Design a protein around this ligand. Structure first.
Ligand code: NA
Lengths: 240, 241, 244, 244
């Protein structure tokens, strides 16, 4: 029965021994749900957020599961210096980086006629520029090693959808899809694949459970998506 | 790590443990056969189908040699509705149930429109698009009659989207498959069935895809990791925007 | 106000002197609406349809506008022999062909689970294969003359939309989109451009809060037939579903 | 031969009695080429750019056609104050505003690993944020009157294309496409349609074996500004990459 919220599946070893860094991972949300999935799949995890108290509580909750290593690094993704320090501390604490999941993003609800420059710029900075910062810091690191890796960006159906009062967030998210495509071509040189998931915001008569989005992230992080780069996977809007 | 090097096929990770997976056009070494192998590596019992009767039996025996799940073979000309209907029934009789269908069967060509023959046009469409409808109808009829659901994976093509000289028949057919995936997916929710497609490219890494890589993505779409997805088409890999 | 049905605009000489052939053009429908638009734009027109008596009446109604010349040729588009004769008789009656508009489509509402092959094949034949037949016959004509031309295909939003009980029409129309792309690349060699319009259709929700007037769809067909679309080939123009 | 550059076509009266504002329209390039097309089609035009002398020169050249009125207003599109005053000045000098064409854009060639925040932000500001500023200013005007109008953005195939070293420009142009879709929905209220053209560019490549002449891109913009696109809003028209 597809209309009933399904139970989160077990791990299947998809990421065993990989170090996975996930942003916007404080408290309930796709970020923490993705960190948990990575742990379920046998990974060591580094979680990051601007919000220090809830990041710490999230780290403790993940550690309690008694799976692999869990580290937390504070990072304001609007700061280049902090995003560069995020990658450096990740490698310091966990020995390497294998997978980056770029979740950080900021929504809103404002028609173009009422749009302020301050909100427009903030949404782009948090939702789109942050992905660039973290991809830049990650690729610099991957260029310097031989084992390569994977990045997974989290876009949104709003990148495709015509939606009243969502022009900021939609433009930032369409921006993320294009950045995913173009950085993927560049990333081949460093042995890195880059793809994105695009969550819907419904065919089953229900919304996705967070775990279902994280499960598709895990696929794009895993060797099951070996040949895919520069792709954007709708979860789930029947994207044509 | 060097992405232009052909990677080694990965081990199974239990993604389809206990499921019955039927794979069409699966005689040989091609994508059908490879996908059947992936299904077995993932813990599935498998039924393979094809019209190459001897080649199929031989493929079945080789897949049986792995000593994993059960392998059954069922002959089917996918241009015959009676044969496709009988494929689903025999699969269900032999293996006990059907959980996942993979629609591989397709037919290529190279002919400009200006000199296209009706015969070639009709055959490409029949093998490539109409077979997928035949197999999907028969499976949804089965699924309708039981309480469990399941999953169908279609195999489309980047040619559905790409403007390509001399491919109008195959491109139209594969674009047809994408649309059929979408519409049948909305209908299939009722029976607890998800329907998606993979879309192979024909190069960012400077190498072609290994058939095993396409099969790995099919396995994803057959598995619970794709739990929320239905009526999607996943490019493997053309950077589809 | 955008939610009110707008009045049809005047002609602007976008097709002055061109021979435009339009299929599924008898009676009331996008075909006859497209033929009228062609005439408003200065064209001579050949209209085609299955139903002989209805086609003659539309031919008379159109010639009465007192604009370009209007000819009619009967064609069952499921017949290769008849589509081949449509182009032949078009050139015989009007002297040449400049623009072909492929309108023919057959709708349905049947789930896959209960789909009959009879309906499936019929829908594919009328909606997709006829477009291949007509494009083949046109390109064959263009290969034999010292000029090119333009084809405009009529697809549908259903090519993209996931819709219960429309898998046949949807497959056929997505098929028309891919045919439009591939045939366009080939048609370059003949100096022929090929594009498609993709009209929205109610599922039974629209940006303006109204359906399109047929004239609005024909006006976009006119654009794709005209020199305004000079650089475009192999495109599919949504009218109008905010296609991303 | 479609590989031979076609001659710019005559006006056909598609914009009679309209005031058309075009940005980045000084000198050579799509803006000035678009302003010329607006004039050929019977519009009065206001052209805008940052370069005062080059803008004045263009104004005099377009005025020397002896067609519609040409005004010029200097505007730095990275400045909200200047963009707001661009719209005000347009309405003051020309009487009203009917069509805005958002042409400004800025590119680069920089791999992500080498990307500076400053270049990233500059490219997004000029290519994407400027379109928001201009659209916000125009919609404020249209809201305050009981007539509608039309906005046309100019995106790029780069919104869709995976291209080494263009991640900033690509993100910006993909963003323009999404902004076009969402602003189109809101604009219905004010009687305004908003669509975009998306010009192709050679990867190395193009169907015709030639790049588009600027006029051909302007001719499609004219269609999007005209009543021939009556039913379209929130659409992105590829000129011409065979967008599926
Ligand atoms: Na051939």
């Amino acid at each position: 029965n597809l209309s009933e919220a399904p139970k989160e599946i077990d791990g299947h070893g998809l990421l065993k021994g990989k170090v996975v860094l996930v942003t916007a991972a404080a408290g309930t949300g796709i970020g923490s749900t993705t960190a948990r999935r990575a742990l379920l799949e046998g990974a060591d995890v580094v979680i990051s957020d601007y919000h220090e108290r809830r990041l710490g509580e999230t780290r403790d909750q993940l550690a309690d599961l008694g799976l692999g290593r869990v580290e937390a690094v504070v990072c304001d993704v609007t700061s280049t210096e902090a995003v560069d320090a995020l990658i450096t501390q990740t490698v310091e604490k966990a020995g390497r980086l294998d997978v980056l999941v770029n979740n950080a993003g900021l929504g809103g609800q404002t028609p173009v006629v009422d749009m302020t420059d301050e909100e427009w710029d903030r949404v782009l900075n948090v939702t789109l520029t942050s992905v660039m910062r973290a991809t830049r810091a990650a690729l610099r690191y991957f260029r310097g090693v031989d084992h390569g890796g994977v990045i997974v960006n989290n876009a949104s159906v709003l990148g495709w959808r015509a939606q009243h009062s969502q022009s900021h967030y939609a433009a930032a998210k369409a921006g993320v899809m294009a950045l995913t495509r173009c950085s993927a071509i560049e990333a081949v040189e460093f042995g890195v694949r880059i793809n994105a998931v695009s969550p819907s915001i419904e065919a089953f008569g229900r919304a996705a459970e967070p775990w279902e989005v994280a499960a598709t992230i895990a696929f794009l992080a895993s060797d099951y998506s070996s040949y895919m780069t520069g792709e954007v996977v709708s979860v789930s809007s029947q994207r044509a």
